[PDB]
Every structure is written in structure tokens, then in C-alpha cells.
Design a protein around this nucleic acid. Structure first.
Lengths: 89, 136, 131, 201, 83, 163
RNA sequence: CCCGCGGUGCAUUAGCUAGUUGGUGAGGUAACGGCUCACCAAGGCCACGAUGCAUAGCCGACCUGAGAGGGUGAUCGGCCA
RNA sequence: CCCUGACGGUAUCUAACCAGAAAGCCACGGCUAACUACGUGCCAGCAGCCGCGGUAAUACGUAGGUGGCAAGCGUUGUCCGGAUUUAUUGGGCGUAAAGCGAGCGCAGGCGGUUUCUUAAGUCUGAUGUGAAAGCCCCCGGCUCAACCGGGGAGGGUCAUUGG
């Protein structure tokens, strides 16, 4: 059950998140496999940076996003590309 | 040495030792006494009181006590300042510090920390001697 | 018994230098001839002539003195010793006396000075300091 | 804490004015206390390095921790010396900028003006006096309420305006043109005694 | 099989056991504090299909998998025989 | 040679010493002085003298100190290279330093170093700390400093060929 | 699961091993193997420190020092019990 | 399109009023910056090391003054430095501590000159790896700073393969 989920990295009331691919048994801030982009809930139009050439490779191997990761992966047009590669060939 | 002698048998340095050794103690409750637990102070109960005369060439009658500590080893300790209130079986607190009056004393009691009381004239270094600030 | 002929050569040079006379002779060897040429190229020795009869030797050195009979080599030291050898990497080559002195290093392409080695970027055994 | 004492005993103890040449050492140029006029023997070379350090620390009214951190920071430049870079970083703090510009007579007054929230850098208010003013930033006088008694009068009487300070007395904007130099900055005390004082800290 | 195992070299030391020989591989390594080079030795056990090689031989061995409580190597070839 | 004493020289006391000599009856006492002398430009001398009072002593010492002076080369406020000066149980190491670093040197050696105009240098005393022998060892170590020009002259080379 | 190399004191601790070291076969396990059996032999480890006794979770890291080093393994992450 | 805040009416911003509520601890004989009075009289007491105290004590106890730091200031305990005082870097053995009373010798350590070869040590190139957070370098965000984020270097006595 590989996942693609968020990981908290702020101070106390100014949170920040790294987008990371981890085994689902791991702790939220513990071990992971690799990091895939960044996400900032402040900064009114929220800031996303991500590689999007590893997201498409993990997605095709059975990794699965959480609910917020799917929202910010569709705002970037990554889910459409998965759609157009899988069920189109 | 040649470096071959050094390789056969290396260099060894000297070992240092405290001068407050009764302040690394351990209990005597369940099994035995443990040495890891360096303390800044220890407490105890005074099993005697009184006075003693210094070395050469000083001259006085210096006040002291004998105290049994929580770890059950016995030491004598100087009581400083002018005038105290310590009697048999009153509980006190010790810190390090060795007096150069006579042998066998390596500790100080701290004034105003338990049954012991701060000295009642001081005006100038009351943080030692445990005196509170007077409106005078 | 003799165990370090390079150190013996160096101490002959230093001993005959301190008493300030103008010749010296040693039994020859391929390494001592190399460092005699290196000592001649930089300006410490005046000359070197090669006699050879029926055993190894010999090598004759002609020292060099200033204008008021002061000395151009002031000391001389053996670094690698049989008993503790000293190897140096291309970025560890030493600079004796802030460039005013030389080091002598044996590499895969000769016995050369320490400038010629940090210009080629290699290292090796360190023979001596002469300042 | 900052300091509130008589501020003039301080100059008599360093042997330097500290207040824009306005004379605290006019009468009685000796030290305070009973043993003032009756001086005594020589001073060590520890007293000398301590006295230089205290001169610099009391010039700009800061505390010992902050002084030492600023000194440790100036040591990471390695472009120039280490005492020059120090005394130049010391000048770029928002309090000296208000002093030099001319909106205040003293440095204590300038400190209270920047503390009580009457000045602005680039329009935005800034309240803390240890701020680091960079080169080319017009610091202003809170165009909300720039009609105050003392600011007005202390803009008129210009005792000292330097060769690195720019200013216009209508909009009340100033800025540093470029960084100063030792010739332009107290070539009287030191920067070498102070550097030695921190070698054995 | 594009991945490769470890081969070594040594001189045989014991040949008493049936089908098994101890090989000593020798190397020099330095001292951590002081500089100079000391020599170091470790013994290996290797497998012998027919109890061939003898003492003084200079052999090569290769890493296999557990063949007993102690032996992990096999006998590749004999390079140079003692006489 | 003699650097002749005809300059602007700022002296300095390095030590004084109450020294006795027991005679019939009681005790005599003199004062010995150790003084350095220089101009903060590269000429430094040391000298000592004794008298029955402190001013007379320091005077005779400056008298003595001026009779000797050393040249002390340098290459831009920093010594040319690294030297070790040894004189009777006093060993002193001196290194070239970085521009604007100061002098990190002990009591006796810093007087010698400052009155020759040295600005940036590091020192260490691996020996005894008796003032006279420290001063003598320090001056013994400056005399080993070699100019870059002289070396190029002694050998058959030019400069920019050995630097 | 197997292997190379690396990090502690004591020689006023020198001998330790009898499933012990190797072979044949049989059973057994995800899996190779004395892992466990029956038989056959007499081997294995040690001054390059075996064995025993005392103390200790290990590392990224942290403090100090010009460096080489020395002293710790609390907050936070990894492995173990 | 529509729908959800425990913190919490929290941070923050604006108006009025008032210098009004908000400074202490250690030291001052030499090391080591900062001195005069009075009390007491080898007593009462002080000390990190030197050492003070028996009638004019800058060393004890108070007062006035002065110095260092400051919402803290001192004291005890533990570790590294200073300590080249275990010395590879970087020490020594005539008299200061220190050459076994002398030989013979197994293991070990170190070895004369030279031709060809090898490549174990030695030197060097390329590839993999040495997590993240830390120390460090550049850049950016909280009114500044602590703190927070982005991109790098560094760290192996490491492995493989070619000179």
C-alpha cells in the first residue's frame, strides 16, 4: 500500500508540507521512499512545486494519493495525463 | 620510543579523581550503591556539633558538624558565617568546597536551605549566607 | 650496519657544509645521482662529476658559498624513513618555507621537484626538504 | 534593559565625549567618585583593551550579548579587515540612521523615536532599534503625524550631516549613498585593541 | 549471473579433514594512530571434491553459500605447487 | 651591522626585579630592569641595566638597549615565513598571519613584536617563561628570517622563478 | 539469510571445544546449513590475544580543540531488544 | 453551484488617558577593571592559589564611593582547553625521574650495488553509493532576530572498472 501523502514541516502555527511517497505503515513524519514536490497552505493562491515526471511513474506502479494530494495533482493536470496514458495506451 | 615500540605497546595517560567523592553516591535501599549519578548537593542529618582548632599558623575555634548522608557514608562539613542554629538531629544540605584549616573536611553546608538558617546581620553578600533582602 | 644511504648522503652534505669546505665524495647510487642533479638545477650545488672504477661509486659534489662566504643551503632533512614511510597525495604536496625552499618527491614519472609535481597533479614518496 | 543613568559620568570614565562634542568634559575632566582629582599609577594592558571596548559599547548604547554577536557576524566577511567591517556594520543600525539623518539630537532620543513607532522604511513602519538598514532605503518620518515639536526643531539645527548621508528636508527622506570609511568615522579610538580584546575573550 | 562473487588467493595450511582445507589469505594494513604497515591474516575454509591440494600450494577460492557450520568457499584452481 | 641610534624610538619596560646580595650584617638591594626599544618600523633592540633606584635602572637599560638593533624584514606587515627561535630553555614559534588578524602573542614576545612594526602574526612559547630568555629567543628567531631577494641572489636564479 | 572491513578494560585473566570440527545418508524449514538424527574419522580456535571476568543498546549526530584529537549518544530520524 | 474552525472574539489594526504601575546580584591586596572612613584586636571571621587578622587592616564586619553584567546575578557538580602534563602531529634517560650486572639466541622489526619482469603497497581517471533533519555557502518569509523554507557543497580507512 504505497501512498502519496503530506508531511508536516512548519514551526507551531505556520505549517508547511512536503509531498512524499511512503509505505502506509510508516509514521507521518518518519521514514519514506522519496520526496515529490512541495505544498504551501498559506500564500493565498497556494504554492505547489512538483516534479511530475516521478508522479506519473509512481502512479503507474500502483501508488495511490490521499484526498488532498489528488486535489493538488488535478489542479496541475497530472491525473488527466494518467488517464490518457492508461486507458488509452 | 621507536614507533615500533609504540605500536607494540601504546601510550597511557593518568587518571583524574574528584575532591568531592562523597557526592557521586547511590542508595542503600533495595540492593547496593550505584556510581553514575553525580550530584551538585546531598543532604543529611547532623550527628554532632562543636568546634575545632586550625593548622599552623592560624588560630581560632572553627565551627563544624558531622553528617550522615542519604547514601550512608559519613563526612564532616564546615558551617560558615557568624552564628548558626544547628543542633543534634537537624537536617542539612552540603555542597562542595574544601576548607584549609584542618584535614578531613571537604564540604560546606549551605545556609538557609533546610533546617539551617541564614545569618541575621548581613548586608553585603546575602546571596551567600542565605539572607533575605531587608527594608532596613 | 648502514640502513639508510640517502640519509647518509644528506648528512655528509650537511656536515661538510657546516664546516664550510668545498668538496665532498660519496659512493654512487641511482637515487643519489638523481637528487644531485636536482640540487644542481636549483642553485645549491656548483657542480657534480661522475667517476666510477670497480664498485658502485663515486660522486663528487662541489659546494657553493655566497659573496662573503655565507652558505646557500642552510639545512637539509630526511622525511621518509625506513621504519615509517611517508606517502603524499596530489593535493597534499608540501610547500617548504613558503616556496623559498624545495621538496623532492618520487612519482610514477621521475624523481622531481615539488613544483613540477603540483603542476602535473600527482604524488608519491617524499624524500627530503632542503631549504 | 538599556540604561538610564546620568550619562555623563560615562564620558568622564572613558575620556571621550560621546555626545556630539557637546562638552561633558568641560569642567572636571577626571573620573567620578572620591578619588577623582587625585589620580594614581599606571593602567595595565588589560585596562587599555577593556577601556577601548567600553568606549565602543557605550557609543551606540547596546548590551554585551548583542555587541559580541555583531562582532562574530562581522568576522564572516573576509573582504577587508575585521575591525573596519565591525565598526561599519555598527553604523548601519536604524538608530544611527536617525541620528545621522538629523531627526534627533542625541542617540537616546533617536532610539525612543524609532521605538515608539514614528518612523518607516520604504513606507512600512519598523519599530525595533537594532534593525539593519541596508544601502539605498529611504527611511521616513511617519507621514501620518510628522508635526511633532522636537523633530521639527531638531531638523533645523544641523550640527553634523556627513558625506555618505543623503537627505531632503521637505519630504523628510534620507538614505545612505554608500558605505562609509574609517577616515570618515572616528579615527580616534581604535579597531585593533577591540579585536585583540576578543582573542582571549 | 551478471553479478559477481569474491575470489581470493592464499597458501593451504591444513589438509586433515576429508574434503576440506584451510587457506590463509595475507595482507598488510596500517595502524590508526601511528603510520606504519603491519601484516594481517585471516583463515578461510574451502571445499574439495576429492582432497587434492596440499600444503604450500598457492590456490584461489570463491564464495558460495553455507556448505557447513564454518565453510563458505570452494576450490577454484591450483596456481603453483610446492616441492 | 650597527643600526646607529639616531631615530624616533619608543621604549617599553618588560620587567623589573628586586635582587639582593647578603653581606656582613644585613642585606643589600638593587633593581634590575629589562627594556625594549624600537620605532615601530622594523628596528628593535633589547637591553638591560641595574642601578640602586628604578629610574636610574631603566635609564641605564635604555642606554644599553640602543647599542644593539636588528633589521627585521617583512613582506607587507607580515613576516616572510615561519621560524623557531631557541635560546637556553626558551622556545618560541612564529607564523605568518592573515591581513588584519592582529598579534596573538604572550607578554614578553608581544613587546618585541609590536615595537618593530609587526601587525599580523601568531606565536607560541613551547618552553620556559623567564622574561629575559623569552626576549633573547625571540630576537634569535627574527635573525633567521630571509628576504625573497637575497635567496634569489645567492642562487643563480631570478625571483618569480622561486616563489 | 550469508560474507569483507570498523568501533572497551583487565595477562595481579593462557589454554578453550565432545554436536565439538569434517564426511555419508535420513528427517526437517520459505530457505542453504550439525538445524536435528544414525554411522565413520579425529579434528576446530588460540600471542595477529582464544577463554573468563567487569562495564555498555548502536548510529546520524552533539560539546570542546589551531588541528590531530578527547568527552557524550537527552529533545528530533534510522536500526535493534 | 453548494457545503465545514477546537484554537477563538486569538493574533492584529484604530481612538482616548497617564511618566504615571516595572532593578537587582556580584566584586574592589596580587593574578584581575574597581578605595577611603569607622568598629573589632591572631578574637570574631575570610580564602581558587599566594595568604590575611596581636591598636592607626584598601584582605574581617558596616557605611559612602567605584567596577562588571543585567531580568537576571553568583555558588556547587560534570566534561574539553590552557597541559608538548603519554609528546603521530609534538618530550626525554652522565649529575634533576629514567640504560636490564653481562652475554647467547627462537619469533618479530629493519637491511649493500645492479639488468629484465610483476603490480601487493603507492599515485591517478570514470561510474555507484555515503537517507532526511543538523554544522557550513548562496537565496527567500515572519515589523527584526531566534526560528522557518528552497538550491548546493562537505563527510569513506568504501565498492567496481581503466591507466
Amino acid at each position: 500500500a504505497v501512498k502519496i501523502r503530506l508531511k508536516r514541516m512548519g514551526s507551531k502555527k505556520s505549517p508547511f508540507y512536503r509531498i512524499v511517497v511512503a509505505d502506509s505503515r510508516s509514521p507521518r513524519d518518519g521514514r519514506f521512499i522519496e520526496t515529490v514536490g512541495t505544498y504551501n497552505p498559506l500564500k493565498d493562491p497556494a504554492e505547489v512545486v512538483l516534479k511530475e515526471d516521478l508522479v506519473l511513474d509512481w502512479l503507474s506502479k500502483g501508488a495511490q494519493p490521499s484526498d488532498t494530494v489528488r486535489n493538488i495533482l488535478s489542479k496541475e493536470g497530472v491525473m488527466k495525463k494518467h488517464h490518457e496514458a492508461k486507458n488509452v495506451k | 620510543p621507536t614507533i615500533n615500540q609504540l605500536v607494540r605497546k601504546p601510550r597511557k595517560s593518568k587518571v583524574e579523581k574528584s575532591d568531592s567523592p562523597a557526592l557521586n553516591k547511590g542508595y542503600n535501599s533495595f540492593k547496593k550503591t550505584q556510581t553514575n549519578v553525580n550530584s551538585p548537593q546531598k543532604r543529611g542529618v547532623c550527628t554532632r556539633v562543636g568546634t575545632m582548632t586550625p593548622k599552623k599558623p592560624n588560630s581560632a575555634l572553627r565551627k563544624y558538624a558531622r553528617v550522615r548522608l542519604s547514601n550512608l557514608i559519613e563526612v564532616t562539613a564546615y558551617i560558615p558565617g557568624i552564628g548558626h542554629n544547628l543542633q543534634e538531629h537537624s537536617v542539612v544540605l552540603l555542597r562542595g568546597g574544601r576548607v584549609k584549616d584542618l584535614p578531613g573536611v571537604r564540604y560546606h553546608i549551605v545556609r538557609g536551605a533546610l533546617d539551617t538558617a541564614g545569618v541575621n546581620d548581613r548586608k553585603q553578600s546575602r546571596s551567600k549566607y542565605g539572607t533575605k533582602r531587608p527594608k532596613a | 650496519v648502514m640502513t639508510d644511504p640517502i640519509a647518509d648522503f644528506l648528512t655528509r652534505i650537511r656536515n661538510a657544509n657546516m664546516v664550510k669546505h668545498e668538496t665532498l665524495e660519496v659512493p654512487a647510487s641511482k637515487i643519489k645521482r638523481d637528487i644531485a642533479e636536482i640540487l644542481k638545477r636549483e642553485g645549491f650545488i656548483r657542480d657534480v662529476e661522475y667517476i666510477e672504477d670497480d664498485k658502485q661509486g663515486v660522486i663528487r659534489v662541489f659546494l657553493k658559498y655566497g659573496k662573503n662566504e655565507e652558505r646557500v643551503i642552510t639545512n637539509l632533512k630526511r622525511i621518509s624513513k625506513p621504519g615509517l614511510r611517508a606517502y603524499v597525495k596530489a593535493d597534499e604536496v608540501p610547500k617548504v618555507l613558503n616556496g623559498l625552499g624545495i621538496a623532492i618527491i618520487s612519482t610514477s614519472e621521475g624523481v622531481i621537484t615539488d613544483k613540477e609535481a603540483r603542476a602535473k597533479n600527482i604524488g608519491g614518496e617524499v624524500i627530503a626538504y632542503v631549504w | 534593559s538599556r540604561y538610564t543613568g546620568p550619562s555623563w559620568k560615562v564620558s568622564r570614565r572613558l575620556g571621550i565625549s560621546l555626545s556630539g562634542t557637546g562638552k561633558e568634559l568641560a569642567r572636571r575632566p577626571y573620573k567620578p567618585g572620591q578619588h577623582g582629582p587625585n589620580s594614581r599609577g599606571k593602567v595595565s594592558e588589560y585596562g587599555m583593551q577593556l577601556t577601548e571596548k567600553q568606549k565602543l559599547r557605550h557609543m551606540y548604547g547596546m548590551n554585551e550579548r548583542q555587541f559580541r554577536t555583531l562582532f562574530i557576524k562581522a568576522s564572516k566577511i573576509k573582504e577587508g579587515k575585521h575591525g573596519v567591517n565591525f565598526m561599519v556594520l555598527l553604523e548601519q543600525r536604524l538608530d544611527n540612521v536617525v541620528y545621522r539623518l538629523g531627526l534627533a539630537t542625541t542617540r537616546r532620543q533617536a532610539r525612543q523615536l524609532v521605538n515608539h513607532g514614528h518612523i518607516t522604511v520604504d513606507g512600512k513602519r519598523v519599530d525595533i532599534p537594532s534593525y539593519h538598514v541596508e544601502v539605498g532605503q529611504v527611511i521616513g518620518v511617519r507621514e501620518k503625524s510628522q508635526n511633532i515639536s522636537t523633530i521639527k526643531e531638531a531638523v533645523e539645527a544641523t550640527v553634523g550631516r556627513p558625506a555618505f548621508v543623503s537627505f531632503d528636508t521637505e519630504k523628510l527622506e534620507g538614505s545612505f549613498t554608500r558605505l562609509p570609511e574609517r577616515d570618515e568615522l572616528y579615527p580616534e579610538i581604535d579597531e585593533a585593541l577591540v579585536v585583540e580584546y576578543y582573542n582571549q575573550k | 549471473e551478471r553479478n559477481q562473487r569474491k575470489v581470493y588467493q592464499g597458501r593451504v595450511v591444513s589438509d586433515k579433514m576429508d574434503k576440506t582445507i584451510t587457506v590463509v589469505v595475507e595482507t598488510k594494513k596500517n595502524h590508526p594512530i601511528y603510520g606504519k604497515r603491519m601484516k594481517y591474516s585471516k583463515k578461510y575454509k574451502a571445499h574439495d571434491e576429492n582432497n587434492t591440494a596440499k600444503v604450500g600450494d598457492i590456490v584461489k577460492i570463491m564464495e558460495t553459500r553455507p556448505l557447513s557450520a564454518t565453510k563458505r568457499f570452494r576450490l577454484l584452481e591450483v596456481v603453483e605447487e610446492a616441492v | 651591522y650597527i643600526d646607529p641610534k639616531h631615530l624616533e624610538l619608543e621604549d617599553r619596560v618588560v620587567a623589573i626585579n628586586r635582587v639582593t646580595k647578603v653581606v656582613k650584617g644585613g642585606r643589600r638591594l638593587r633593581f634590575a630592569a629589562l627594556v625594549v626599544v624600537g620605532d615601530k618600523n622594523g628596528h628593535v633592540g633589547f637591553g638591560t641595566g641595574k642601578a640602586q633606584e628604578v629610574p636610574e635602572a631603566i635609564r641605564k637599560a635604555i642606554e644599553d638597549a640602543k647599542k644593539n638593533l636588528v633589521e627585521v624584514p617583512m613582506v607587507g606587515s607580515t613576516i616572510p615565513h615561519e621560524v623557531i627561535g631557541v635560546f637556553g630553555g626558551g622556545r618560541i614559534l612564529m607564523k605568518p598571519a592573515v591581513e588584519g588578524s592582529g598579534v596573538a602573542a604572550g607578554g614578553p614576545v608581544r613587546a618585541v613584536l609590536e615595537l618593530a612594526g609587526v601587525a599580523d602574526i601568531t606565536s607560541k612559547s613551547l618552553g620556559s617563561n623567564t622574561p629575559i630568555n623569552v626576549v633573547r629567543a625571540t630576537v634569535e628567531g627574527l635573525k633567521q628570517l630571509k628576504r625573497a631577494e637575497e635567496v634569489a641572489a645567492l642562487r643563480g636564479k631570478s625571483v618569480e622563478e622561486i616563489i
